[PDB]
CSV table of C-alpha atoms in Angstrom, one decimal:
chain,number,residue,atom,x,y,z
A,247,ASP,CA,60.7,96.9,120.6
A,248,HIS,CA,63.6,95.3,118.8
A,249,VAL,CA,63.5,92.9,115.9
A,250,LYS,CA,66.1,90.8,114.1
A,251,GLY,CA,65.7,89.5,110.5
A,252,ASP,CA,65.0,85.8,110.2
A,253,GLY,CA,67.5,85.3,107.3
A,254,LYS,CA,64.9,84.3,104.7
A,255,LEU,CA,64.6,86.9,101.9
A,256,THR,CA,61.2,87.4,100.3
A,257,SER,CA,59.8,89.9,97.8
A,258,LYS,CA,56.7,92.1,98.1
A,259,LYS,CA,55.5,94.6,95.5
A,260,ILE,CA,53.0,97.6,95.6
A,261,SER,CA,51.8,100.5,93.5
A,262,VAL,CA,52.8,104.1,94.4
A,263,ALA,CA,51.9,107.6,93.3
A,264,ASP,CA,54.4,109.0,90.8
A,265,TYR,CA,57.5,110.7,92.3
A,266,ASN,CA,60.4,112.8,91.0
A,267,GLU,CA,62.5,112.8,94.1
A,268,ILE,CA,64.0,110.0,96.3
A,269,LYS,CA,65.4,110.0,99.8
A,270,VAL,CA,67.3,106.9,100.9
A,271,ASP,CA,69.1,106.2,104.2
A,272,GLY,CA,70.4,103.0,105.7
A,273,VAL,CA,72.1,99.9,104.3
A,274,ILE,CA,69.8,99.5,101.3
A,275,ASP,CA,70.4,98.4,97.7
A,276,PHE,CA,68.1,100.9,95.9
A,277,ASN,CA,67.5,100.2,92.2
A,278,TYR,CA,65.8,103.0,90.1
A,279,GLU,CA,64.6,103.1,86.5
A,280,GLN,CA,63.0,105.9,84.5
A,281,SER,CA,59.9,104.7,82.8
A,282,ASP,CA,56.3,105.7,81.9
A,283,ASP,CA,55.0,102.4,83.3
A,284,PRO,CA,52.9,102.9,86.5
A,285,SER,CA,55.2,103.4,89.4
A,286,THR,CA,55.7,100.4,91.7
A,287,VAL,CA,58.0,99.7,94.7
A,288,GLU,CA,59.3,96.1,95.2
A,289,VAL,CA,61.0,95.3,98.5
A,290,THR,CA,63.1,92.2,99.1
A,291,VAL,CA,64.0,91.9,102.8
A,292,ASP,CA,63.9,89.3,105.6
A,293,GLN,CA,60.4,87.9,105.5
A,294,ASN,CA,59.6,88.7,109.2
A,295,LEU,CA,60.5,92.4,108.6
A,296,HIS,CA,58.0,93.3,105.8
A,297,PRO,CA,55.3,94.5,108.2
A,298,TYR,CA,57.8,97.2,109.4
A,299,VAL,CA,58.7,98.5,105.9
A,300,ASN,CA,57.1,101.9,105.4
A,301,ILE,CA,56.9,103.0,101.8
A,302,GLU,CA,55.6,106.6,101.3
A,303,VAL,CA,55.2,109.1,98.4
A,304,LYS,CA,54.4,112.6,99.8
A,305,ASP,CA,54.4,115.7,97.5
A,306,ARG,CA,56.1,113.6,94.8
A,307,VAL,CA,59.0,112.4,97.1
A,308,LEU,CA,59.6,108.6,97.7
A,309,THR,CA,60.9,107.5,101.1
A,310,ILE,CA,61.4,103.9,102.2
A,311,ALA,CA,62.3,103.1,105.8
A,312,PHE,CA,61.5,100.9,108.8
A,313,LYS,CA,58.6,101.9,111.1
A,314,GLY,CA,57.3,100.5,114.4
A,315,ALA,CA,60.3,98.5,115.7
A,316,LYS,CA,64.0,99.0,116.1
A,317,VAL,CA,65.4,96.6,113.5
A,318,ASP,CA,68.7,95.4,115.0
A,319,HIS,CA,69.7,93.2,112.0
A,320,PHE,CA,68.7,92.2,108.5
A,321,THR,CA,70.3,90.1,105.8
A,322,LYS,CA,69.6,92.4,102.9
A,323,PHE,CA,67.2,95.2,101.9
A,324,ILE,CA,66.7,95.5,98.2
A,325,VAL,CA,64.4,98.1,96.6
A,326,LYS,CA,63.3,98.2,92.9
A,327,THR,CA,61.2,101.1,91.7
A,328,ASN,CA,60.4,103.4,88.8
A,329,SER,CA,59.0,106.9,87.9
A,330,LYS,CA,58.7,109.2,84.9
A,331,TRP,CA,61.3,111.6,86.2
A,332,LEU,CA,64.2,111.9,88.7
A,333,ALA,CA,64.8,115.6,89.5
A,334,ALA,CA,66.6,114.8,92.8
A,335,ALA,CA,68.1,112.1,95.0
A,336,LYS,CA,69.4,112.3,98.5
A,337,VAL,CA,71.5,109.3,99.5
A,338,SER,CA,72.8,108.7,103.1
A,339,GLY,CA,73.6,105.9,105.5
A,340,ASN,CA,75.4,103.2,103.7
A,341,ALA,CA,72.9,103.2,100.9
A,342,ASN,CA,73.8,102.0,97.4
A,343,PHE,CA,71.8,104.0,94.9
A,344,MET,CA,71.7,102.6,91.4
A,345,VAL,CA,70.0,104.1,88.3
A,346,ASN,CA,69.8,101.1,85.9
A,347,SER,CA,68.2,102.8,82.9
A,348,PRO,CA,69.1,105.7,80.8
A,349,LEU,CA,68.1,109.0,82.5
A,350,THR,CA,66.7,111.9,80.5
A,351,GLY,CA,65.4,115.3,81.6
A,352,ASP,CA,66.0,118.9,82.5
A,353,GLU,CA,68.0,118.8,85.8
A,354,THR,CA,69.0,116.1,88.2
A,355,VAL,CA,70.6,117.0,91.6
A,356,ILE,CA,72.1,114.1,93.6
A,357,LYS,CA,73.5,114.5,97.1
A,358,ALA,CA,75.4,111.6,98.7
A,359,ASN,CA,77.0,111.5,102.2
A,360,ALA,CA,77.8,109.2,105.1
A,361,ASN,CA,79.3,106.2,103.3
A,362,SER,CA,76.9,106.0,100.4
A,363,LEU,CA,77.6,104.9,96.8
A,364,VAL,CA,75.7,106.3,93.8
A,365,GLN,CA,76.0,104.5,90.4
A,366,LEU,CA,74.4,106.0,87.2
A,367,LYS,CA,75.0,103.1,84.9
A,368,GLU,CA,73.5,104.2,81.6
A,369,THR,CA,73.6,107.3,79.6
A,370,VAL,CA,72.4,110.4,81.5
A,371,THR,CA,71.1,113.0,79.0
A,372,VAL,CA,70.2,116.1,80.9
A,373,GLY,CA,70.4,119.9,80.8
A,374,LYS,CA,72.2,119.9,84.2
A,375,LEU,CA,73.7,117.2,86.3
A,376,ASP,CA,74.6,118.6,89.8
A,377,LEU,CA,76.6,116.2,92.0
A,378,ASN,CA,77.4,116.9,95.6
A,379,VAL,CA,79.5,114.3,97.7
A,380,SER,CA,80.5,114.6,101.4
A,381,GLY,CA,81.3,112.4,104.3
A,382,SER,CA,83.0,109.5,102.7
A,383,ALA,CA,80.5,109.1,99.8
A,384,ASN,CA,81.3,107.9,96.2
A,385,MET,CA,79.6,108.4,92.9
A,386,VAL,CA,80.3,106.6,89.6
A,387,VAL,CA,78.7,108.0,86.4
A,388,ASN,CA,79.3,105.8,83.3
A,389,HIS,CA,78.1,108.2,80.5
A,390,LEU,CA,76.9,111.8,80.6
A,391,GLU,CA,75.6,114.0,77.8
A,392,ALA,CA,74.9,117.4,79.3
A,393,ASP,CA,74.7,121.2,78.9
A,394,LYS,CA,76.1,121.7,82.4
A,395,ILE,CA,78.0,119.6,84.9
A,396,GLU,CA,78.5,120.6,88.5
A,397,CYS,CA,80.7,118.5,90.9
A,398,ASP,CA,81.3,119.3,94.5
A,399,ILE,CA,83.5,117.1,96.7
A,400,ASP,CA,83.3,118.4,100.3
A,401,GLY,CA,84.5,115.0,101.9
A,402,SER,CA,86.9,112.0,101.8
A,403,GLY,CA,85.1,110.6,98.7
A,404,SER,CA,85.3,110.5,94.9
A,405,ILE,CA,83.2,111.3,91.9
A,406,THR,CA,84.1,109.3,88.7
A,407,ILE,CA,82.6,110.3,85.3
A,408,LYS,CA,83.9,107.8,82.8
A,409,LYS,CA,82.8,109.2,79.5
A,410,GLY,CA,80.7,111.7,77.5
A,411,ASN,CA,80.3,115.5,77.0
A,412,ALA,CA,79.3,118.5,79.0
A,413,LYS,CA,79.2,121.9,77.3
A,414,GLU,CA,80.2,123.7,80.6
A,415,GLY,CA,81.5,122.5,83.9
A,416,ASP,CA,82.2,123.8,87.5
A,417,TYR,CA,84.2,121.4,89.6
A,418,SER,CA,85.0,122.0,93.3
A,419,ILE,CA,87.1,120.0,95.8
A,420,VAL,CA,87.2,121.4,99.3
A,421,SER,CA,88.1,118.1,101.0
A,422,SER,CA,90.7,115.3,100.6
A,423,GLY,CA,88.5,113.9,97.8
A,424,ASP,CA,89.1,113.1,94.1
A,425,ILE,CA,87.3,113.9,90.8
A,426,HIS,CA,88.1,111.4,88.1
A,427,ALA,CA,86.8,113.0,84.9
A,428,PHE,CA,89.5,112.5,82.3
A,429,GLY,CA,86.8,110.9,80.0
A,430,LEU,CA,84.3,113.8,80.2
A,431,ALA,CA,85.1,116.3,77.5
A,432,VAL,CA,84.2,119.8,78.6
A,433,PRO,CA,84.8,122.8,76.4
A,434,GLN,CA,84.4,125.5,79.1
A,435,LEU,CA,85.7,124.1,82.4
A,436,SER,CA,86.4,125.7,85.7
A,437,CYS,CA,88.0,123.6,88.4
A,438,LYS,CA,88.9,124.7,92.0
A,439,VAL,CA,90.9,122.5,94.4
A,440,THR,CA,91.2,123.8,97.9
A,441,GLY,CA,91.9,120.5,99.6
A,442,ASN,CA,94.7,118.1,99.2
A,443,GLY,CA,92.3,116.5,96.7
A,444,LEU,CA,93.1,115.6,93.0
A,445,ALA,CA,91.0,116.7,90.0
A,446,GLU,CA,91.6,114.8,86.7
A,447,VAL,CA,89.8,116.7,84.0
A,448,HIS,CA,89.4,117.1,80.2
A,449,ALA,CA,88.9,120.7,78.8
A,450,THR,CA,88.6,121.1,75.0
A,451,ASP,CA,88.6,124.9,74.7
A,452,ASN,CA,89.2,126.8,77.9
A,453,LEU,CA,90.3,125.7,81.4
A,454,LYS,CA,90.1,127.9,84.5
A,455,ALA,CA,92.3,126.2,87.2
A,456,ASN,CA,92.6,127.2,90.8
A,457,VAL,CA,94.6,125.5,93.5
A,458,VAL,CA,94.9,126.8,97.1
A,459,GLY,CA,97.3,124.5,99.1
A,460,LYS,CA,98.7,121.1,98.3
A,461,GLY,CA,95.9,120.0,95.9
A,462,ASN,CA,96.5,118.9,92.3
A,463,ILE,CA,94.8,119.3,88.9
A,464,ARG,CA,95.7,117.1,86.0
A,465,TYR,CA,94.2,117.9,82.6
A,466,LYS,CA,94.0,116.4,79.1
A,467,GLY,CA,93.8,119.0,76.3
A,468,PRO,CA,93.7,120.5,73.8
A,469,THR,CA,92.9,123.6,75.9
A,470,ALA,CA,93.8,127.2,76.7
A,471,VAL,CA,94.5,127.5,80.5
A,472,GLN,CA,94.0,130.3,83.0
A,473,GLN,CA,95.8,129.0,86.1
A,474,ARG,CA,96.3,130.3,89.7
A,475,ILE,CA,98.2,128.4,92.4
A,476,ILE,CA,98.5,129.6,96.0
A,477,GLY,CA,101.0,127.3,97.7
A,478,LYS,CA,102.8,124.1,96.8
A,479,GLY,CA,100.1,122.3,94.7
A,480,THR,CA,100.2,121.8,91.0
A,481,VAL,CA,98.3,122.1,87.7
A,482,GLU,CA,99.8,119.9,85.0
A,483,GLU,CA,98.9,118.7,81.5
A,484,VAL,CA,98.7,114.9,81.0
A,485,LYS,CA,99.5,112.6,77.9
């Protein structure tokens, strides 16, 4: 069976068990906040498609997807939900995953692929933030305060981190992708570019820079540098 959205957006809201992990796929605007309030999921979608919306929490993982009809078309699909913690998110399809509150906790691992967007809009205060983009996925992180940052670009996409601090960092670009992290101050930074990607970084004590091929690393100091270039790429200080 196939169904088409009727064009008239309505909202419905339910209570869900608490969850620490999210899986999102499809063209969905997915809004998350960290809060102690009882977890709810609100869905705004074409009014005729609500009966096919399947919201599940299983072993603390939230999935929201369509069930019991091939949905050919919808106008918009907006999720708004909350939980006490976000340890992990997996973001695929053309999903737009937005964390709209501060995020605090031990470790958060986010994986984005296909043509997804992740936006962490408020301060992320964590022990570890582990970011892994592939396909043509993008992440934007407004403000991080962390013990450890890990960034992996294995695709045509980009990770931006606009400001903050991370005590240690491991950045890796294997693809054509870009890391824009001039505003993240990292004392102990290692950064490997194997693609023809670009890493823009800020090390404040020690930088370990590796380029294999035509890739490029630009860094803001003040930092001591260990650098190794195999091929025609470059590692150069900015400012």
